[PDB]
Amino acid sequence: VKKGFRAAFRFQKELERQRLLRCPPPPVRRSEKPNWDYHAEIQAFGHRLQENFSLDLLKTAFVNSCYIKSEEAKRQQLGIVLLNLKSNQELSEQGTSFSQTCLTQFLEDEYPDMPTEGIKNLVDFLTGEEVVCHVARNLAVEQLTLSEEFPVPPAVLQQTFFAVIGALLQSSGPERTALFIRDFLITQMTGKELFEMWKIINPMGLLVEELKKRNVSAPESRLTRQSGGTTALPLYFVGLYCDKKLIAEGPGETVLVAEEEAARVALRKLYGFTENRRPWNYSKPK
Amino acid sequence: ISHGRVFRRMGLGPESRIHLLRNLLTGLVRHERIEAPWARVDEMRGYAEKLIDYGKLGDTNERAMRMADFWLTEKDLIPKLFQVLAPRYKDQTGGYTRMLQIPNRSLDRAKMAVIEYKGNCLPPLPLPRRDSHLTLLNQLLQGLRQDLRQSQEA
Amino acid sequence: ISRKWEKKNKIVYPPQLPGEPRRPAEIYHCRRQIKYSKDKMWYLAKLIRGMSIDQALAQLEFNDKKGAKIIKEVLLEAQDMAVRDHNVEFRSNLYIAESTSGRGQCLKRIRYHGRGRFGIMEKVYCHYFVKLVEGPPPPPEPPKTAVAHAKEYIQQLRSRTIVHTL
Amino acid sequence: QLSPTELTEMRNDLFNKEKARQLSLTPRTEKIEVKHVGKTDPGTVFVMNKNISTPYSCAMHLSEWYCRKSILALVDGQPWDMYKPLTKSCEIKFLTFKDCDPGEVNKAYWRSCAMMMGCVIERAFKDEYMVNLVRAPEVPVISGAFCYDVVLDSKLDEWMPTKENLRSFTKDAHALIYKDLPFETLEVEAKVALEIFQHSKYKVDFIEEKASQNPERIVKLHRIGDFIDVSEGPLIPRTSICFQYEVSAVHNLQPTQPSLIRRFQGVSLPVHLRAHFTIWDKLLERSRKMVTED
Amino acid sequence: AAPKNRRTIEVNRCRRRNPQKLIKVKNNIDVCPECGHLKQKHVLCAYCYEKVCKETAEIRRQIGKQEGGPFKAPTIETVVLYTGETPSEQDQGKRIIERDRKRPSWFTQN
Amino acid sequence: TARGTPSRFLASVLHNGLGRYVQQLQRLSFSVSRDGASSRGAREFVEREVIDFARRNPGVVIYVNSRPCCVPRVVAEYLNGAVREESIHCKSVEEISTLVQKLADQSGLDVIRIRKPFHTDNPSIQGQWHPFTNKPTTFRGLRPREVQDP
Amino acid sequence: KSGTWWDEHLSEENVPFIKQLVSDEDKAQLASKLCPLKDEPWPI
Amino acid sequence: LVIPPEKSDRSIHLACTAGIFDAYVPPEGDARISTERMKKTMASQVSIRRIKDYDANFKIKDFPEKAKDIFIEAHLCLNNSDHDRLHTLVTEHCFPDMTWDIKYKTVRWSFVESLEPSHVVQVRCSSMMNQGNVYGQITVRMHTRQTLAIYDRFGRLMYGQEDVPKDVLEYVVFEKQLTNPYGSWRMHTKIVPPWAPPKQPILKTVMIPGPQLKPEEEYEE
Ligand SMILES: [Mg+2]
Ligand SMILES: [Mg+2]
Ligand SMILES: [Zn+2]
């Protein structure tokens, strides 16, 4: 046995790190952890975002129906009204409607050549659970969300996020909220390809109908390039020609794959979603 | 190289091999069933078959009596050979013994065999039996046989 | 010494919910201080690994090694223990999930050499460990086929980027 | 009438519905005592669950060897499918292909091979042509081939299968074996079966004959996958038992005037009794000859 | 000659776990139809063989008591008779060995 | 080490700075001793520096907890969920100010090897090179040594 | 999965019959080839 | 372990007996109701008196209510394995029988209703100063609805159902140490009538192995 306490203490700390790593503890809400003041956290949330929220509206936006029903069940179990707590349902609906109309206006003005179906799919992707939950989690919305279950269900988190938008709309108005939607939802299109957000089937069928609407002849498929035709790794470039004029060209490992890719390229050009299109303008409105 | 070498190398040399085989054969004649290492039983089985042939020559054949005197170390067994074992096989031309492999010996895991003179009074060994003629395969072959015999007579 | 293997049969799981699937039974058993080498015993524990309880018992019954008779004795008492204590319905519905050997506590003795020289011999001991799981033996993994090889090769050709540039 | 795909869906639903009904009759988990009367493991008693526990479950209590070698069960002296639920306290024995007298097992395997051929025949022809399953004649094993009487469309009245076609039927049979499907059994009243097989005239006549034979008018139904048929007796547990299987010949039965009944024929051997290539070829040749049930 | 270097565990595992070193699975095991215990196809059932040997030992002990000394092998054939049995016509002139038990079912009188 | 450690690509949190800049530092938790000598510099930072630092960063909630401790620590938490603990043991007031300001400016991503000193989602405007980019086309797309109209 | 050989499952009665059957076929096949020039030979 | 060291002044201090002093056999057909009577009653009255001797303020009328509370609380300890509190509610004879078989099992038991009020069927006392200790045993009759759902070590339902109440007629015997100043009334054992209906069947199937015969041995009918 060696004299001393420092080495033993240090080894205890390491034994406690290893024990925790072997059995990671079940996660808990940040509010349940130490160093939490809800009122201070609410105020910082608005200040981080450079938004002049109304603290009464902002707090209600975080209150969910599930948290109210469970809070009452706990009250009944303990035999304990003062729980006249308003949910975020009304704010959620207002924010959801505004976001959809606002995103539709942003996208219609930017890409006038996209049909309504495409714009609707883009709005559905931007306001979908996956995108909205990612943005909400990285804006501390989940920490401030009052929910019955933790981790907060994705549908609940999405509802809370749009409730916060509703609170902003009442607090600051449509113009200020539109900038918020531009800076945290429109940005989520960065790098995305058109058909990575708008999931379509049979692009050639869609292309033929669009060209008919434009009074353009049906596209003829032709082989522009070819390599390794008889091998296990072919390359094909299929070009689509309208009146013997090239509209689009697409590569693929098979002629069928190359042709379908060429149709997608034609659709991207027709709708103004080319990879090299003018980037979205985030500059302050004049 | 051991091409065409029909005899095993056992014991301490050629003489000891014969003595080892003789003691086994003497045990077999007395008890009519013995168990021993498989290789040694296989070696001795040839001698046990030929001993019966000498016994069939009769106790008046001096050559047969000398052979029996050498191979049977217990002399009460010589009357048994000429008067019990050899008469029992009077109507056979061979196949006096049966040799079957038994589970490996416990101590040294040696391969083991049981050998007996057929027609002894001891409880019968659990001999291997071929599948019944009533099995699916054997019935399908019986039909094929019946069919072939009918076509030949026609 | 450590004796954690004997404590794994004392874990009590919470009752399952109505919708959850049937949880297979797990039975841990071992034998300590076997007068046999862990290196030789490893070849026997490796043999029955993954087998059914009845196939493992059949292979060990006709093996000539001394460890075979010891493992078979451990498997029989783990089979009986499974049905009697661990609520296993069918005694044949078991397979060898884990089976290995471990070094035991050994003794040292002198081995005499010529010229007044000597060596130290270890009188070796080993442990044998087995884990039985309720159910049929998991099917063996089929060997990789040409279609899978080509599919993986093309997948590597499609995952390659332009390195050290924009 | 119903399409072929819809007809199977209807029959399976009726089969499943009747199976569920019989299961509901069982109150909680009543217990039966099944005594083993076999030569080995003498005196073993199985305390099993009435109408749920099958002979196979009793084999599972013994060892894997019983489960692999047991092809049929002898329940109170009566041949019993391995997957047929036991209904009462009784005595049980297990039968293998290699028993001294495997006559009952041979018939069970012999009947199941015919039922697998019917499944192949019904699903092989193009949708244009109509296939009407008739019956599986009970022919002795020594006859050399198992046979199944079928009636084909009038369009195929001058068509005889080619060797490649016969090989195509065999490849379909071997896919059924590879699927390793259990032979599910159901003993239902004549009324239930008559509803299942209403669309087929031959089955209705066959079902009526079987019901008349038995005082309680219960008919034995079997199913493999999605194919349901009416049987003469107990069947083998699974289709994986078959190892060598080939549809040998198709004969046109006489008289042909009323209807042209085509006798499809095959021969098979289980895994336990598989034959050498040379011997198997000789059995295939005799199987190709016409068998006349007596 | 002595090792120039210690052999690594990586190298040693390749040698020790090479398929040539592993125990091979036996495919010739089967159930004995008489007793249900396991046997190899080419080898007599261990359970049945032991049963035969045990009865054989009892008969040989009885033969000893009748002979009552070394070098007393008879010059006539022998028959084993069990309780409730009497010498047959073909058992006359043969040494009778009497066993105090019932004839085993597997021991058919011939 | 590079081979002995993990790596990542240059990235941001929610495309920060594209539409607007959002400070990623969200919370600061100080643990100062009232009497410990090792907390002398931390006590002086709480008397004159922390209040002015909070005025400049209204989006960061600072939690100062005075309790017995041998090693005073500051715990920084970021919007992406990263948690960073930094000891201020025996540090001067100026040293602590520098550390706290650094925590304020960091994104919260792992401080590990960054493979590339740049990131872009649109590396090409004119079309990424492929083997046919600079190859001419031939009449009827005929291959080398290919007989036409045979 | 256990290996088998040609007479493993054959009964006492069927082993001689099978031996005779295959033997006769072997002899018949060899006798059927004794006249190559009467059986469409290739050009000499 | 049967006896500690010899020639020791200290001895083992037992707090309970192993059996019922005079086993109460319940009349046949009692489940349906759901001279000798006096003789049995007189024996109970005598025994009751020596119970009221050591403890003056004892009421037979109050016991059946107390007995039910002891019973319910004792069985509730099995649900949470509250073994420290169980020793106060049951004797050392009862404790092994209750807990030994459930050490690695989960028992979910509940009390639903009492169909018939509990009736003190018999009261009896031990022979005075067995070893300086006198014990009083009070047999009680309980007709109540209970729910039991035992699980195995892997959380799989092993016996009973968790929501279906079933009728239970069981005559629980209690026992107290009258001489001991801190003695209390504690569930001592259970009387199982021979005519009692068979228990509900278990879920799993069982195999009863036949005789394991050595090669020399043969199987007999
Ligand atoms: Mg030697
Ligand atoms: Mg010396
Ligand atoms: Zn046997």
PDB file of N, CA, C and O in Angstrom, chain C residues 52-55 58 79 89-93 137, chain D residues 41 48 57-65 67:
ATOM      1  N   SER C  52     -26.662 -27.411 -31.889  1.00  0.00           N
ATOM      2  CA  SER C  52     -27.786 -27.697 -31.018  1.00  0.00           C
ATOM      3  C   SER C  52     -27.311 -28.538 -29.839  1.00  0.00           C
ATOM      4  O   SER C  52     -26.236 -29.141 -29.868  1.00  0.00           O
ATOM      5  N   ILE C  53     -28.129 -28.572 -28.787  1.00  0.00           N
ATOM      6  CA  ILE C  53     -27.744 -29.308 -27.588  1.00  0.00           C
ATOM      7  C   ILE C  53     -27.552 -30.784 -27.913  1.00  0.00           C
ATOM      8  O   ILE C  53     -26.647 -31.439 -27.382  1.00  0.00           O
ATOM      9  N   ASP C  54     -28.390 -31.329 -28.796  1.00  0.00           N
ATOM     10  CA  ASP C  54     -28.316 -32.752 -29.107  1.00  0.00           C
ATOM     11  C   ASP C  54     -27.179 -33.070 -30.069  1.00  0.00           C
ATOM     12  O   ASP C  54     -26.562 -34.134 -29.955  1.00  0.00           O
ATOM     13  N   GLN C  55     -26.876 -32.167 -31.003  1.00  0.00           N
ATOM     14  CA  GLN C  55     -25.750 -32.394 -31.900  1.00  0.00           C
ATOM     15  C   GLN C  55     -24.427 -32.268 -31.158  1.00  0.00           C
ATOM     16  O   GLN C  55     -23.494 -33.038 -31.412  1.00  0.00           O
ATOM     17  N   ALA C  58     -23.839 -35.426 -29.213  1.00  0.00           N
ATOM     18  CA  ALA C  58     -23.486 -36.564 -30.050  1.00  0.00           C
ATOM     19  C   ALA C  58     -22.032 -36.495 -30.495  1.00  0.00           C
ATOM     20  O   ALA C  58     -21.345 -37.521 -30.541  1.00  0.00           O
ATOM     21  N   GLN C  79     -28.416 -28.664 -19.432  1.00  0.00           N
ATOM     22  CA  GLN C  79     -29.694 -28.964 -20.071  1.00  0.00           C
ATOM     23  C   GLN C  79     -30.771 -29.220 -19.024  1.00  0.00           C
ATOM     24  O   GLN C  79     -31.864 -28.644 -19.085  1.00  0.00           O
ATOM     25  N   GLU C  89     -39.220 -25.161 -21.829  1.00  0.00           N
ATOM     26  CA  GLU C  89     -40.237 -26.184 -22.044  1.00  0.00           C
ATOM     27  C   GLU C  89     -39.635 -27.457 -22.628  1.00  0.00           C
ATOM     28  O   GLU C  89     -39.764 -28.537 -22.042  1.00  0.00           O
ATOM     29  N   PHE C  90     -38.968 -27.350 -23.773  1.00  0.00           N
ATOM     30  CA  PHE C  90     -38.408 -28.498 -24.473  1.00  0.00           C
ATOM     31  C   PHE C  90     -36.902 -28.534 -24.263  1.00  0.00           C
ATOM     32  O   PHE C  90     -36.210 -27.548 -24.538  1.00  0.00           O
ATOM     33  N   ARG C  91     -36.397 -29.672 -23.784  1.00  0.00           N
ATOM     34  CA  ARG C  91     -34.978 -29.794 -23.476  1.00  0.00           C
ATOM     35  C   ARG C  91     -34.110 -29.882 -24.723  1.00  0.00           C
ATOM     36  O   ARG C  91     -32.909 -29.606 -24.643  1.00  0.00           O
ATOM     37  N   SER C  92     -34.681 -30.260 -25.867  1.00  0.00           N
ATOM     38  CA  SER C  92     -33.927 -30.297 -27.113  1.00  0.00           C
ATOM     39  C   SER C  92     -33.881 -28.946 -27.814  1.00  0.00           C
ATOM     40  O   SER C  92     -33.093 -28.779 -28.750  1.00  0.00           O
ATOM     41  N   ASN C  93     -34.697 -27.985 -27.385  1.00  0.00           N
ATOM     42  CA  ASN C  93     -34.775 -26.676 -28.034  1.00  0.00           C
ATOM     43  C   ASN C  93     -33.724 -25.730 -27.450  1.00  0.00           C
ATOM     44  O   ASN C  93     -34.018 -24.648 -26.944  1.00  0.00           O
ATOM     45  N   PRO C 137     -30.781 -23.649 -33.499  1.00  0.00           N
ATOM     46  CA  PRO C 137     -29.474 -23.046 -33.777  1.00  0.00           C
ATOM     47  C   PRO C 137     -29.567 -22.043 -34.912  1.00  0.00           C
ATOM     48  O   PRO C 137     -30.180 -22.332 -35.951  1.00  0.00           O
TER      49      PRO C 137
ATOM     50  N   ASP D  41     -36.895 -45.295 -24.707  1.00  0.00           N
ATOM     51  CA  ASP D  41     -37.436 -44.381 -23.706  1.00  0.00           C
ATOM     52  C   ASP D  41     -38.759 -44.914 -23.166  1.00  0.00           C
ATOM     53  O   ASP D  41     -39.772 -44.204 -23.190  1.00  0.00           O
ATOM     54  N   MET D  48     -49.307 -32.877 -21.880  1.00  0.00           N
ATOM     55  CA  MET D  48     -49.394 -31.951 -22.999  1.00  0.00           C
ATOM     56  C   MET D  48     -50.699 -31.164 -22.942  1.00  0.00           C
ATOM     57  O   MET D  48     -51.583 -31.432 -22.126  1.00  0.00           O
ATOM     58  N   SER D  57     -44.388 -32.084 -30.764  1.00  0.00           N
ATOM     59  CA  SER D  57     -44.015 -31.472 -29.493  1.00  0.00           C
ATOM     60  C   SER D  57     -43.550 -32.524 -28.496  1.00  0.00           C
ATOM     61  O   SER D  57     -42.653 -32.266 -27.686  1.00  0.00           O
ATOM     62  N   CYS D  58     -44.145 -33.719 -28.541  1.00  0.00           N
ATOM     63  CA  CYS D  58     -43.677 -34.804 -27.686  1.00  0.00           C
ATOM     64  C   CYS D  58     -42.274 -35.246 -28.085  1.00  0.00           C
ATOM     65  O   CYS D  58     -41.437 -35.532 -27.222  1.00  0.00           O
ATOM     66  N   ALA D  59     -42.002 -35.311 -29.390  1.00  0.00           N
ATOM     67  CA  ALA D  59     -40.654 -35.622 -29.850  1.00  0.00           C
ATOM     68  C   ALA D  59     -39.663 -34.560 -29.396  1.00  0.00           C
ATOM     69  O   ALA D  59     -38.524 -34.877 -29.031  1.00  0.00           O
ATOM     70  N   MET D  60     -40.077 -33.290 -29.411  1.00  0.00           N
ATOM     71  CA  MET D  60     -39.196 -32.221 -28.954  1.00  0.00           C
ATOM     72  C   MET D  60     -38.835 -32.386 -27.484  1.00  0.00           C
ATOM     73  O   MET D  60     -37.756 -31.960 -27.059  1.00  0.00           O
ATOM     74  N   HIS D  61     -39.721 -32.996 -26.693  1.00  0.00           N
ATOM     75  CA  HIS D  61     -39.393 -33.265 -25.297  1.00  0.00           C
ATOM     76  C   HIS D  61     -38.308 -34.326 -25.169  1.00  0.00           C
ATOM     77  O   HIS D  61     -37.544 -34.313 -24.198  1.00  0.00           O
ATOM     78  N   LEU D  62     -38.222 -35.247 -26.128  1.00  0.00           N
ATOM     79  CA  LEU D  62     -37.264 -36.356 -26.044  1.00  0.00           C
ATOM     80  C   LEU D  62     -35.889 -35.906 -26.528  1.00  0.00           C
ATOM     81  O   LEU D  62     -34.959 -35.759 -25.731  1.00  0.00           O
ATOM     82  N   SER D  63     -35.749 -35.683 -27.831  1.00  0.00           N
ATOM     83  CA  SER D  63     -34.478 -35.242 -28.392  1.00  0.00           C
ATOM     84  C   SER D  63     -34.701 -34.832 -29.841  1.00  0.00           C
ATOM     85  O   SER D  63     -35.783 -35.017 -30.403  1.00  0.00           O
ATOM     86  N   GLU D  64     -33.647 -34.274 -30.440  1.00  0.00           N
ATOM     87  CA  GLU D  64     -33.696 -33.896 -31.847  1.00  0.00           C
ATOM     88  C   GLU D  64     -33.748 -35.119 -32.753  1.00  0.00           C
ATOM     89  O   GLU D  64     -34.283 -35.041 -33.865  1.00  0.00           O
ATOM     90  N   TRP D  65     -33.198 -36.247 -32.302  1.00  0.00           N
ATOM     91  CA  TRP D  65     -33.218 -37.458 -33.115  1.00  0.00           C
ATOM     92  C   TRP D  65     -34.648 -37.903 -33.401  1.00  0.00           C
ATOM     93  O   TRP D  65     -34.981 -38.274 -34.532  1.00  0.00           O
ATOM     94  N   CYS D  67     -37.266 -35.969 -33.486  1.00  0.00           N
ATOM     95  CA  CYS D  67     -37.876 -34.990 -34.379  1.00  0.00           C
ATOM     96  C   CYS D  67     -37.452 -35.217 -35.824  1.00  0.00           C
ATOM     97  O   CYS D  67     -38.240 -34.998 -36.752  1.00  0.00           O
TER      98      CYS D  67
END
